[PDB]
Paper text:
Proteins from the bacterial small multidrug resistance (SMR) family are proton-coupled exporters of diverse antiseptics and antimicrobials, including polyaromatic cations and quaternary ammonium compounds. Representatives of the ‘Gdx’ (guanidinium export) subtype export a bacterial metabolite, guanidinium ion (Gdm+), in exchange for two protons. Representatives of the ‘Qac’ (quaternary ammonium compound) subtype are proton-coupled exchangers of quaternary ammoniums and other hydrophobic, cationic compounds. The overall fold and many of the binding site sidechains are shared between [name] and Gdx-Clo, yet the two proteins have markedly different substrate selectivity profiles.
We were able to obtain diffracting crystals in the presence of five structurally diverse compounds transported by [name]: monovalent planar aromatic harmane (3.8 Å), divalent planar aromatic methyl viologen (3.1 Å), quaternary phosphoniums tetraphenylphosphonium (TPP+; 3.4 Å) and methyltriphenylphosphonium (MeTPP+; 3.2 Å), and quaternary ammonium benzyltrimethylammonium (3.9 Å). Although the crystallization conditions varied for each substrate, the TPP+-, MeTPP+-, benzyltrimethylammonium-, and harmane-bound proteins crystallized in the same unit cell as proton-bound EmrE3, with one copy of the EmrE3/[name] complex in the asymmetric unit. For all substrate-bound structures, the maps show positive densities between the substrate-binding E14 residues, including a four-lobed density for TPP+, a three-lobed density for MeTPP+, and oblong densities for the harmane and the methyl viologen structures. For the other substrates (methyl viologen, TPP+, and MeTPP+), this comparison showed that binding site sidechains, especially E14 and W63, adopt different rotamers, thus accommodating the differently sized substrates. Likewise, the position of the W63A indole ring rotates over approximately 80° depending on the substrate that occupies the binding site. For the Me-TPP+, harmane, and benzyltrimethylammonium-bound structures (pH 6.5, 7.1, and 7.25, respectively), the contribution of a substrate+ proton-bound population cannot be ruled out. However, the positioning of each of these substrates centered close to the midpoint between the E14 carboxylate groups, similar to TPP+, implies that in the major component of the population, both glutamates bear a negative charge.
Author numbering:
A (entry chain B): 2 to 103
B (entry chain D): 4 to 92
C (entry chain A): 2 to 104
D (entry chain C): 3 to 92
The structure:
């Protein structure tokens, strides 16, 4: 259960930071409201998933599955390339998530 | 680009109900600001703002017969030049 | 100068996250207001570093210092609530982080 | 050692009741108190509204005169203490 909401908040923020890059200075009303709704949800999702998983533990897993889903979504259907040594760094984060997971 | 098409729908000697094309969903801004002052300039102009989802706005408290200049600004100049018109009540 | 605002924004987020553990689901005033204030600072500081420092190194430092500062702050104010196989899992998450950003 | 405390009716009125309570110390302050008011008889539900946790007062309108009402102030959760409830005849 706890690692389900943590990922839901990870998905929430990643959608928040992307909708922010789409909208201008919180001017585009639709993706601006999208960012506010996403951050509020992720704020209340991270708030509720912290009483079970330690603070440092959830910070890591987030920093992980975040950039994972960020660069995954980046190569997903936006841009590509970047400094891509390989997906070997993506497979690293997954491992740490696992050996900290249930 | 936005806003586009600023015209006066209904017109009372002391009021002008105006409207504009707010764009389209993914080009909706968060707010427009509307400026109405006398066409001459003996005094400053009057100004207010409207949320970005609304496409119409009412301008009350005008003087009859006077020609006015109404302007609707985007949140920033990045969405295109602000659209302005004139109306004689 | 422009490298300092990162660590301050790191630490501000570090402080805000630890303050969120005190908000009680955002149902306790003073910690709830504090977390909102803390994140407004790190935002404004991070926005002041994106103008100079690239996004890759600015954030790789954030992940590392943060995962160290908040995890060490969760040992004095608390300790551990449900420790599991490895602490190094977080360091190797941080490792894979530093090699999809820097590399 | 619970919150809130000291729920009293400042001003009254046939159709309105001004009430207040002891929010506690600065660490005992919550973000939203939800307050409930209904008829003492109990042939109806109970009206409810929230109010920011930085305000210790709350105004209630739309009441029927002469009737005795019961007013209860809650906390965001039940962790802060038993909610405080009182009575008043307008
Ligand atoms: C508290 P965080 C956040 C979470 C969810 C929505 C919006 C912001 C964060 C997310 C993941 C990992 C660490 C921290 C944040 C806030 C201000 C400045 C930098 C980061």
């Amino acid at each position: 259960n706890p690692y389900i909401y943590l990922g839901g908040a990870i998905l929430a923020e990643v959608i928040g930071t992307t909708l922010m890059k789409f909208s201008n200075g919180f001017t585009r009303l639709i993706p601006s409201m999208g960012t506010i709704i996403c951050y509020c949800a992720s704020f209340w999702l991270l708030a509720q998933t912290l009483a079970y998983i330690p603070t440092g533990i959830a910070y890591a897993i987030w920093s992980g599955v975040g950039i994972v889903l960020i660069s995954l979504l980046s190569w997903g259907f936006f841009g590509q390339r970047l400094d891509l040594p390989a997906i070997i760094g993506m497979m690293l984060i997954c491992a740490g998530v696992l050996i900290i997971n249930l | 680009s936005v806003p586009t098409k600023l015209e006066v729908v209904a017109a009372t000697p002391t009021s002008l109900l105006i409207s504009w094309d707010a764009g389209h969903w993914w080009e909706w801004v968060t707010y427009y600001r509307i400026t109405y002052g006398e066409t001459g300039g003996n005094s400053p102009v009057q100004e207010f703002t409207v949320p970005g989802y609304s496409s119409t706005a009412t301008i009350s408290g005008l003087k009859p017969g006077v020609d006015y200049t109404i302007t609707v600004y985007a949140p920033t100049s990045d969405y295109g030049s602000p659209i302005s018109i004139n109306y004689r009540t």
